[PDB]
Design an enzyme around this catalytic site. Structure first.
Site, PDB file in Angstrom:
ATOM      1  N   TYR A  14     -15.633  -1.859  20.872  1.00 10.60           N
ATOM      2  CA  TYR A  14     -15.730  -2.570  22.147  1.00 10.60           C
ATOM      3  C   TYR A  14     -16.438  -1.743  23.291  1.00 10.60           C
ATOM      4  O   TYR A  14     -16.276  -0.500  23.349  1.00 10.60           O
ATOM      5  CB  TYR A  14     -14.321  -3.015  22.543  1.00 10.60           C
ATOM      6  CG  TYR A  14     -13.296  -2.731  21.482  1.00 10.60           C
ATOM      7  CD1 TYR A  14     -13.104  -1.426  21.032  1.00 10.60           C
ATOM      8  CD2 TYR A  14     -12.494  -3.740  20.966  1.00 10.60           C
ATOM      9  CE1 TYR A  14     -12.172  -1.135  20.074  1.00 10.60           C
ATOM     10  CE2 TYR A  14     -11.543  -3.464  19.997  1.00 10.60           C
ATOM     11  CZ  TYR A  14     -11.394  -2.157  19.560  1.00 10.60           C
ATOM     12  OH  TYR A  14     -10.455  -1.856  18.608  1.00 10.60           O
ATOM     13  N   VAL A  17     -23.238  -3.518  22.327  1.00 13.55           N
ATOM     14  CA  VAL A  17     -24.381  -2.734  22.831  1.00 13.55           C
ATOM     15  C   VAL A  17     -25.692  -3.374  22.349  1.00 13.55           C
ATOM     16  O   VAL A  17     -25.890  -3.595  21.147  1.00 13.55           O
ATOM     17  CB  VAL A  17     -24.363  -1.313  22.312  1.00 13.55           C
ATOM     18  CG1 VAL A  17     -25.364  -0.422  23.075  1.00 13.55           C
ATOM     19  CG2 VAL A  17     -22.988  -0.698  22.505  1.00 13.55           C
ATOM     20  N   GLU A  80     -30.259   4.630  29.629  1.00 14.73           N
ATOM     21  CA  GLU A  80     -31.499   4.906  29.028  1.00 14.73           C
ATOM     22  C   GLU A  80     -31.400   4.576  27.536  1.00 14.73           C
ATOM     23  O   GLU A  80     -30.352   4.833  26.950  1.00 14.73           O
ATOM     24  CB  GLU A  80     -31.900   6.385  29.198  1.00 14.73           C
ATOM     25  CG  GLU A  80     -30.936   7.365  28.540  1.00 14.73           C
ATOM     26  CD  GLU A  80     -31.363   8.838  28.632  1.00 14.73           C
ATOM     27  OE1 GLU A  80     -32.510   9.193  28.366  1.00 14.73           O
ATOM     28  OE2 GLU A  80     -30.542   9.690  28.954  1.00 14.73           O
ATOM     29  N   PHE A  81     -32.496   4.046  26.941  1.00 15.26           N
ATOM     30  CA  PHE A  81     -32.558   3.798  25.558  1.00 15.26           C
ATOM     31  C   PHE A  81     -32.971   5.000  24.719  1.00 15.26           C
ATOM     32  O   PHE A  81     -33.933   5.649  25.023  1.00 15.26           O
ATOM     33  CB  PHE A  81     -33.533   2.665  25.251  1.00 15.26           C
ATOM     34  CG  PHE A  81     -33.651   2.367  23.798  1.00 15.26           C
ATOM     35  CD1 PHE A  81     -32.685   1.631  23.156  1.00 15.26           C
ATOM     36  CD2 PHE A  81     -34.752   2.797  23.074  1.00 15.26           C
ATOM     37  CE1 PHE A  81     -32.802   1.328  21.794  1.00 15.26           C
ATOM     38  CE2 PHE A  81     -34.885   2.513  21.734  1.00 15.26           C
ATOM     39  CZ  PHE A  81     -33.912   1.755  21.102  1.00 15.26           C
ATOM     40  N   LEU A  82     -32.181   5.331  23.715  1.00 19.08           N
ATOM     41  CA  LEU A  82     -32.622   6.354  22.768  1.00 19.08           C
ATOM     42  C   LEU A  82     -32.712   5.749  21.412  1.00 19.08           C
ATOM     43  O   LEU A  82     -32.043   4.776  21.078  1.00 19.08           O
ATOM     44  CB  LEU A  82     -31.697   7.528  22.781  1.00 19.08           C
ATOM     45  CG  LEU A  82     -31.922   8.377  24.020  1.00 19.08           C
ATOM     46  CD1 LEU A  82     -30.739   8.241  24.935  1.00 19.08           C
ATOM     47  CD2 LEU A  82     -32.086   9.862  23.597  1.00 19.08           C
ATOM     48  N   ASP A 126     -14.887  13.355  21.601  1.00 19.66           N
ATOM     49  CA  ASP A 126     -15.278  12.499  20.505  1.00 19.66           C
ATOM     50  C   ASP A 126     -16.679  12.862  20.049  1.00 19.66           C
ATOM     51  O   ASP A 126     -17.499  11.998  19.772  1.00 19.66           O
ATOM     52  CB  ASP A 126     -15.175  11.035  20.908  1.00 19.66           C
ATOM     53  CG  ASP A 126     -15.121  10.090  19.723  1.00 19.66           C
ATOM     54  OD1 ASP A 126     -14.704  10.537  18.621  1.00 19.66           O
ATOM     55  OD2 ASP A 126     -15.394   8.897  19.978  1.00 19.66           O
ATOM     56  N   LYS A 128     -19.238  13.556  17.484  1.00 15.80           N
ATOM     57  CA  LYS A 128     -19.454  13.220  16.119  1.00 15.80           C
ATOM     58  C   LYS A 128     -20.906  12.713  16.062  1.00 15.80           C
ATOM     59  O   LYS A 128     -21.483  12.352  17.122  1.00 15.80           O
ATOM     60  CB  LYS A 128     -18.484  12.204  15.625  1.00 15.80           C
ATOM     61  CG  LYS A 128     -18.513  10.896  16.346  1.00 15.80           C
ATOM     62  CD  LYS A 128     -17.497   9.986  15.671  1.00 15.80           C
ATOM     63  CE  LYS A 128     -17.373   8.690  16.436  1.00 15.80           C
ATOM     64  NZ  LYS A 128     -16.349   7.907  15.780  1.00 15.80           N
ATOM     65  N   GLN A 130     -22.417  10.126  15.156  1.00 21.22           N
ATOM     66  CA  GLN A 130     -22.655   8.731  15.602  1.00 21.22           C
ATOM     67  C   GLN A 130     -22.801   8.653  17.133  1.00 21.22           C
ATOM     68  O   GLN A 130     -23.387   7.714  17.661  1.00 21.22           O
ATOM     69  CB  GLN A 130     -21.499   7.781  15.159  1.00 21.22           C
ATOM     70  CG  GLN A 130     -21.374   7.630  13.636  1.00 21.22           C
ATOM     71  CD  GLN A 130     -20.633   8.797  12.868  1.00 21.22           C
ATOM     72  OE1 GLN A 130     -20.277   9.850  13.389  1.00 21.22           O
ATOM     73  NE2 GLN A 130     -20.446   8.582  11.593  1.00 21.22           N
TER      74      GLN A 130
HETATM   75  C1  LIG Z   1     -28.126   4.127  17.090  1.00 16.52           C
HETATM   76  C2  LIG Z   1     -29.225   3.227  17.271  1.00 16.52           C
HETATM   77  C3  LIG Z   1     -30.019   2.682  16.194  1.00 16.52           C
HETATM   78  O1  LIG Z   1     -29.654   3.012  14.947  1.00 16.52           O
HETATM   79  C4  LIG Z   1     -31.122   1.812  16.319  1.00 16.52           C
HETATM   80  C5  LIG Z   1     -31.465   1.431  17.615  1.00 16.52           C
HETATM   81  C6  LIG Z   1     -30.749   1.975  18.690  1.00 16.52           C
HETATM   82  C7  LIG Z   1     -29.643   2.893  18.574  1.00 16.52           C
HETATM   83  C8  LIG Z   1     -29.047   3.279  19.745  1.00 16.52           C
HETATM   84  N1  LIG Z   1     -29.801   3.603  20.829  1.00 16.52           N
HETATM   85  C9  LIG Z   1     -28.987   3.822  21.911  1.00 16.52           C
HETATM   86  N2  LIG Z   1     -29.247   4.151  23.239  1.00 16.52           N
HETATM   87  C10 LIG Z   1     -28.171   4.363  24.069  1.00 16.52           C
HETATM   88  N3  LIG Z   1     -28.240   4.745  25.288  1.00 16.52           N
HETATM   89  N4  LIG Z   1     -26.899   4.120  23.676  1.00 16.52           N
HETATM   90  C11 LIG Z   1     -26.686   3.748  22.389  1.00 16.52           C
HETATM   91  O2  LIG Z   1     -25.381   3.567  21.978  1.00 16.52           O
HETATM   92  C12 LIG Z   1     -24.303   4.142  22.814  1.00 16.52           C
HETATM   93  C13 LIG Z   1     -23.350   4.252  21.699  1.00 16.52           C
HETATM   94  C14 LIG Z   1     -22.982   5.732  21.324  1.00 16.52           C
HETATM   95  C15 LIG Z   1     -22.626   5.638  19.839  1.00 16.52           C
HETATM   96  C16 LIG Z   1     -21.328   4.815  19.706  1.00 16.52           C
HETATM   97  C17 LIG Z   1     -21.431   3.399  20.357  1.00 16.52           C
HETATM   98  C18 LIG Z   1     -22.076   3.368  21.839  1.00 16.52           C
HETATM   99  C19 LIG Z   1     -27.682   3.595  21.475  1.00 16.52           C
HETATM  100  N5  LIG Z   1     -27.720   3.257  20.124  1.00 16.52           N
END
Ligand SMILES: Cc1c(O)cccc1-c1nc2nc(N)nc(OCC3CCCCC3)c2[nH]1
Ligand SMILES: [Mg+2]
Ligand SMILES: [Mg+2]
Lengths: 265, 262
Positions: A14, A17, A80-82, A126, A128, A130
């Protein structure tokens, strides 16, 4: 409100995203949508902490919170997008392996990020793979601050149910009254070893199995050079008091020749 | 040990010193509140002390709530009938931030005995968050005190509890304590506690750490000493009551020093 954002795809969880794009600026972002419990418990405490702590933490190796968009019923966090997380990167690299220079670069940046947290009295709790995000230019950033907490000096007793099991420090597993910054270092140590093998270091099935795995390994990572192993051993010291700090780890000889390669993405 | 976190304690102290300035309520905001007064605020703060005791909340939670209330009222005009709502919401938020096991919302509605609906509490929660822009990690008197306590050699429990008692009395009276920063109140409280119990003074080591001397601390100290001396007559008495408990070593029963000697 959200009218300038175009959802591009779901990125998982929750709340929910999404990858989105700002129609006017072109910026690509990640949107985290948080349901408000408007008739029951209100804003979740995990959101209150994530937002409040991320607003203070401005650093190249900490995920940037760009905006918080309020409605009566939802909160959206604009980040920001990663481009992906370290776990996916490791899996993609399971056969090829991850070059040492990139491992070193990533570890160095993780420690910079973490030292910034600890210097601003924030425990992540946390860490890890992921939760660690990478871009196509060679940066890595700490993310998902939902379990984070602002600490005091000296620490008090805090939440026991912290850190995913495989990354959990022995002082937590054993139910010590106090834990501190050392718990995040333990997690990073596990992650260091996992970048090298692309396998979790201590993949326990239960709390007892977790403990037994730790004991039999450390006393009751072949490809790593001497300096690497020295650093790893200090990150995984049993005694939290003797465990190396992120600040001191940045001065380790392992990092003397650190660079910033781009990932084989 | 790592619990007291030797690689970072100086960086943290510095950072908190920066942030207490940015999270400081507006001094004399009460003069721009047409419907509420310092007296009403003292009533509210005293009631939050009782709440924290009823629900066994951390003292840090209390301090945070106060900071939230003072910053909220620094920018929002509030009618008297709603001041308790603001306070209830602040305490909820502080609890969510700081407690391992915060009370549920229903407990917070219950403690305002009849006055407000649950809906109003939850809506106010949201409004407080918006007004504070989710900037909730504020430094408190307590965060400085716990660091100052590490300079005792050895630790003295009566000193600690007394310093906490004094800092907490300061929460009650906007006039004068809104003029003073948490680090300064904490320093005055630690010195005054240390003196009352042991005869000792603000140690040199904390001069070095904080940059504060007894000269710098004089004005706050003078106010705190008067507050301490007048405490048995103050209209608000929950802090005194609280600190009679053996949990806090009965420190509210100690006699304040007659004079300070400067
Ligand atoms: C991981 C991924 C892909 O495989 C493919 C496309 C995008 C991403 C991914 N880009 C991301 N950019 C940001 N800022 N946050 C995220 O999640 C925040 C989480 C931190 C991790 C736990 C849930 C919220 C992202 N996940
Ligand atoms: Mg007024
Ligand atoms: Mg003040």
């Amino acid at each position: 409100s959200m009218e300038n954002f175009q959802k591009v795809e779901k990125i998982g969880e929750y709340g929910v995203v999404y990858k989105a794009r700002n129609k006017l600026t072109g910026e690509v972002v990640a949107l985290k949508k948080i349901r408000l419990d408007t008739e029951t418990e209100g804003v979740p405490s995990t959101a209150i902490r994530e937002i409040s702590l991320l607003k203070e933490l401005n650093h190249p190796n900490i995920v940037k919170l760009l905006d918080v968009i309020h409605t009566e019923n939802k909160l959206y966090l604009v980040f920001e997008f990663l481009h992906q997380d370290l776990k996916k990167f490791m899996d993609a690299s399971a056969l090829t392996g991850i070059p040492l220079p990139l491992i070193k670069s990533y570890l160095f940046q993780l420690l910079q990020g973490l030292a910034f947290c600890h210097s601003h009295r924030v425990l992540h709790r946390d860490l890890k793979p992921q939760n660690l995000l990478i871009n196509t230019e060679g940066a890595i950033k700490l993310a998902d601050f939902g379990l984070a907490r602002a600490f005091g000096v000296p620490v008090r007793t805090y939440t026991h149910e912290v850190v995913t099991l495989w990354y959990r420090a022995p002082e937590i597993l054993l139910g010590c009254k106090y834990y501190s910054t050392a718990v995040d270092i333990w997690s990073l140590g596990c992650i260091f070893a996992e970048m090298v093998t692309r396998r979790a270091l201590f993949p326990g099935d239960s709390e007892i199995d977790q403990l037994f795995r730790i004991f039999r390994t450390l006393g009751t990572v072949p490809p790593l050079d001497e300096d690497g192993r020295s650093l790893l051993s200090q990150m995984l010291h049993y005694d939290p008091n003797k465990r190396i700090s992120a600040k001191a780890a940045l001065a380790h000889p392992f990092f003397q020749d650190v660079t910033k390669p781009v990932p084989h993405l | 040990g790592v619990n007291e976190v030797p690689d970072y304690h100086e960086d943290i102290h510095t950072y908190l010193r920066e942030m207490e300035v940015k999270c400081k309520p507006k001094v004399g905001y009460m003069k721009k509140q047409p419907d509420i007064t310092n007296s009403m605020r003292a009533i509210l703060v005293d009631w939050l002390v009782e709440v924290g005791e009823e629900y066994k909340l951390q003292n840090e939670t209390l301090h945070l709530a106060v900071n939230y209330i003072d910053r909220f009222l620094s920018s929002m005009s509030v009618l008297r009938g709603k001041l308790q709502l603001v306070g209830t919401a602040a305490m909820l938020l502080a609890s969510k931030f700081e407690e391992i096991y915060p009370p549920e919302v229903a407990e917070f509605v219950y403690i305002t005995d009849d006055t407000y609906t649950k809906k109003q509490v939850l809506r106010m929660e949201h409004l407080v968050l918006k007004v504070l822009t989710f900037d909730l990690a504020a430094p408190t008197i307590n965060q400085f005190l716990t660091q100052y306590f590490l300079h005792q050699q050895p630790a003295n429990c009566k000193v600690e509890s007394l310093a906490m008692f004094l800092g907490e009395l300061s929460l009650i009276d906007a006039d004068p304590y809104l003029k003073y920063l948490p680090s300064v109140i904490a320093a005055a409280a630690f010195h005054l506690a240390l003196y009352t119990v042991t005869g000792q003074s603000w140690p040199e080591s904390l001069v070095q750490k904080t940059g504060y001397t007894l000269e710098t601390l004089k004005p706050c100290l003078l106010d705190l000493h008067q507050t301490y001396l007048r405490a048995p007559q103050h209209a608000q008495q929950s802090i005194r009551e609280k600190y009679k408990n053996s949990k806090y070593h009965g420190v509210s029963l100690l006699n304040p020093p007659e004079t300070l000697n400067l």
